[model samples]
Target: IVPSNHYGPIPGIPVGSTWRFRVQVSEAGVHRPHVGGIHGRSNDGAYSLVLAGGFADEVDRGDEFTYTGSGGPSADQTLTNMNRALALNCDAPLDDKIGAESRNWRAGKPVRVIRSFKGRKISKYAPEEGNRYDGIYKVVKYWPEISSSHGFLVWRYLLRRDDVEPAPWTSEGIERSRRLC
Candidate 1:
């Protein structure tokens, strides 16, 4: 699903401020789908955003999303390249070798983190199977230059955040998410 909006400088994302986020690599292809928080703490994560189609879709309410995160010289390049676009807001080169590169973009001291969930099918986190948010990730930077895939050049944002949920695996968050579900 693509995001309906375009990417721009996020209000909370300061020039040199370092924030943490948890995202899931839900779909993998020319475009990658990473859905989760932009900056979050233990009790509460401030922003829950999606970087798709080289754009930022945060704090919006919509079931169907239209993203432009696809197309590239390689698989990961397509994804990471899109992330770069979101961060830097320009068409840049795609470096496929940069796997899980968090600190390179943030510039400040890096906080190594992982997403509570990534690469897991939606069915795995459904109501019957029980939803589990335990993965963490942080943003490094955004890169562009992914328009070669025949689709619109996309955006990419590096992220790193950890998940330490002490409550029941299906804790308050899951309860609320379930209610919304």
Candidate 2:
């Protein structure tokens, strides 16, 4: 399998390209999972996510967003692979328990960000129809936080847009996106 550690924006894939399902994101190589929120290994870094608003507490600004980690059942049911995958995005060694802040947020690993319209139920940033490829974002930092909703500790990731492409809503981006369809 291709490692999910190094994925970035798909070349020639303009911002706003949409796919109906997570599998299509995997097929486009933007990410590699059909269900999991993260894609990567304990030894490697994470590459992308589905952005379906799995966690409502997340704050989604256009250029940045706060993401929650996966895992449920109980506080003891802490994340393993998913947490580690995100941790590896940091410039430091992996911390299996408490997440470390990035020395330089922009210098951290690059991750492809896709927004699903389903997220609109909870997030205002979601697109209207399929999952749209936003652009390249870098992991700003990660930390362990208590989830008021889940009543458990979850690893949270902060991502910020870092690509040069015009945002999908911008006039240039809209015209380019229009041409793609």
Candidate 3:
């Protein structure tokens, strides 16, 4: 049920595949965190990210989304552990100070993007039920910002889609997926 963590599209998982729950999602190695936003090591890049309902902090536009980092509240925000792991996806050297954006975002590491039914906050990309493996996204940039609602300084990431396959929810992807299924 476990496999080595890696970056990029996971083998056997199509861009439009779906899993009933988090456990099934993890077991398939699409995303490994039991119940968190990120599943990765600080040394290595992030493996995947789940757009589960949270502080309504994320902005999912189907082709791209903005993500918030895991951290506590306060005026000063730190990258912390998982935040650093996600930042590693950037092509530039690690900079926890002001944060850094990749010179060529496409060169950044690929992160598996999964969407859950609970992620209804500005997220029509999320499937109606279960978690769907949307596809691979690259870290375009990362920066620090204070939350308007929570009143906490948080790290935010810009993820842009790079997958060749159309989204499953879209008419094109469904027809393509149907033939394969």
Candidate 4:
């Protein structure tokens, strides 16, 4: 897996940066996987997310979150594209039969997190306007298991906030929102 120390938040990207499309997020280097939920290579590790809340079992707690990997309950469990891309982020080697969980949660990998307004339907932590750059986060843990809500084998990631910027729901974030307008 790629060393977490090798990359941090993309340089020059401020905490409050926003984008309307996945391509814009890609263009900014916050995430390189466009249209997919994850960005990275299997040989390496994941770098970021374009979180849109595609899973029912996932939880969004602002600075902390539970994110699901791509693919569905169908016959094809073999991951490709972004799904495979995200699996590479795991501390363990890719295994379709098992999901990866970090031996030490803190030792997982660094992942820059972003969210789209589309997630507001399922997650209150989502931005209400366009897509938002929520800032740096780390994969605290990950695992493969049957989703209680979806009733299928899936990969899940636990992430925690690591940035110092004020979260969007905070009063400071509200004030920043006002200034941006």
Q: Model-by-model lDDT, in order?
A: 0.30, 0.74, 0.83, 0.71
User: Each candidate: how many clashes?
Assistant: 42, 0, 0, 0
lDDT of 1 by residue, 50-140 (tens): 3222233241111112223344434433443323333322122334434233344323222212122222233122122212322222344
Error of 2 at 58 (Å): 6.6
Question: How would the candidate models be sorted by TM-score, starting from the highest?
Answer: 3, 2, 4, 1
**Decoy 1 TM-score against native:** 0.27
lDDT of 2 at 113: 84
Q: Which stretches of candidate 3 lie over 4 Å from their true place?
A: 53-58, 148-151
Cα lDDT tens digits, model 4, 36-96, are: 6776766566778877664664478887888777766663344565566665654565666
TM-score of each: 0.27, 0.84, 0.89, 0.76
**Candidate number with greatest TM-score:** 3
Q: Write the per-residue lDDT of candidate 2 for residues 1-181, one digit (tens) a residue.
A: 3444566666666778888877887887777777776777766667876676645555777688887777664764354776677767766655657777777777777777888888887776788878888887887777787766667777787778888887786787788887775
Per-residue lDDT for 1-181 in model 3, tens only?
3365777788778988888889998888888876877888888878888976544655677777888887676556687688998999988888888899899998888899998998765566778888889898988999988778778778988889888889877899889788885
Show the colliding residue pairs in model 4. Answer: none
**Candidate 2 error regions (>4 Å):** 1-6, 77-79, 96-98, 148-151, 179-181
- Window of ten residues with lowest summed lDDT in model 4: 1-10
Off by over 4 Å in 4: 1-6, 76-104, 147-152, 175-181
